[PDB]
Structure 1
Amino acid sequence: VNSFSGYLKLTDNVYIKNADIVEEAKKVKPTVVVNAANVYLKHGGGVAGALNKATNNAMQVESDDYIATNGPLKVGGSCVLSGHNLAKHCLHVVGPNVNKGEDIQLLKSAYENFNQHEVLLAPLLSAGIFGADPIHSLRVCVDTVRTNVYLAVFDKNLYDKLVSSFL
């Protein structure tokens, strides 16, 4: 039993809700919140901009030190950093950005990072400003993630389309 509330169950292990991931993280304080990161951990907009803003820029400060030490992530890769006031940990996951020409096949590799964590609160990777089809992202999520994932979808219209079209 866990504290996630109001989710629709899609499969044995995937759940979905129309919710602002920032407000959801603040309420649940999950062990892991997933950020829709880029390789530079520059949290300017989309989900990343919103999560970082909610930490009062502490996520960005921590991220800049991480990059100075380790260099950029790989597309499809991830790193675990602090969850600040939102979660115990933040899993920064880089899905391919279609508006940069990145291989959509890398989306499966990106979701594989979720399997290293038993339970996660997450957005749909590569959706939003990353330019991928969210219906496809949900399909890859369901077919790749085996751990327990709670997906927060900000847009109500998109949420209804994802549920109604789910196979």
Structure 2
Amino acid sequence: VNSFSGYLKLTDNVYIKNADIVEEAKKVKPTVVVNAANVYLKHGGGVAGALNKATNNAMQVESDDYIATNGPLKVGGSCVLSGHNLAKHCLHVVGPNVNKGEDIQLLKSAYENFNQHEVLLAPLLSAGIFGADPIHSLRVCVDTVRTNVYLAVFDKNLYDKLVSSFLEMKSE
């Protein structure tokens, strides 16, 4: 468990890899895989749908049970559900949907949830369907997270641009 391999280390606690989060989950067997969710735990495109599909939809049924009991999450909030076959647990975190003008400042709140967990395999919250700049998502992660976060970026082109943007931002 937690056998992460082939990451580039950006800070003492932030690692990045050009990889699909589901395939990493299957290789690594993490204690915590992070889902970039919405407040209803309705897993659409993006990481949520990729993770959900890999669980043969058990993730969405569990989420439906969670929501029926406790109601929707808040933006910036989270909940720990089961990791099924991918991880021990899945951290479901709701970043701001900047497409709907939700407060980008809640991206910081979202990443805070990471600090409740020694080690996580995570994507870049709000960076796809929710419309945030991926560079900005990385900046907020490295600035907010103090635990060990292994970031999976599947698109090689985004990953190269993200590394070169981080080198610039760290050196100023």
Is TM > 0.5 for Structure 1 vs Structure 2? yes
Q: Deviations over 1:81-102 (max 9, x none)?
A: 0000000000000000111221
How far residue 44 of structure 1 moved from its aligned partner, in angstroms, is 1.4
Which TM-score applies when normalising by structure 2? 0.95
- Distance in 2, matches of 1:81 and 1:131, equals 25
- Distance in 1, matches of 2:153 and 2:137, equals 12
Which TM-score applies when normalising by structure 1? 0.98
- Distance in 1, matches of 2:2 and 2:61, equals 31
How far residue 129 of structure 1 moved from its aligned partner, in angstroms, is 1.1
Q: Deviations over 1:45-75 (max 9, x none)?
A: 1100000000000000000000000000000
8 A contact 2:40–2:67 mirrored in 1: yes
How far residue 2 of structure 1 moved from its aligned partner, in angstroms, is 5.1
8 A contact 2:2–2:30 mirrored in 1: no
1:77 matched residue in structure 2: 77
Number of residue pairs aligned between Structure 1 and Structure 2: 167
- Distance in 2, matches of 1:155 and 1:77, equals 27
1:146 matched residue in structure 2: 146
Flag structure 1 segments of 5+ consecutive residues without an equivalent. none
Flag structure 2 segments of 5+ consecutive residues without an equivalent. 168-172
Q: Percent identity?
A: 100
Q: Deviations over 1:23-52 (max 9, x none)?
A: 110111100000001000000111000000
Query: Deviation above 4 Å: which 4+ runs of structure 1?
Result: none
Aligned-CA RMSD value: 1.1
- Distance in 2, matches of 1:50 and 1:99, equals 21
Q: Deviations over 1:130-162 (max 9, x none)?
A: 100000000000000000000000111000001
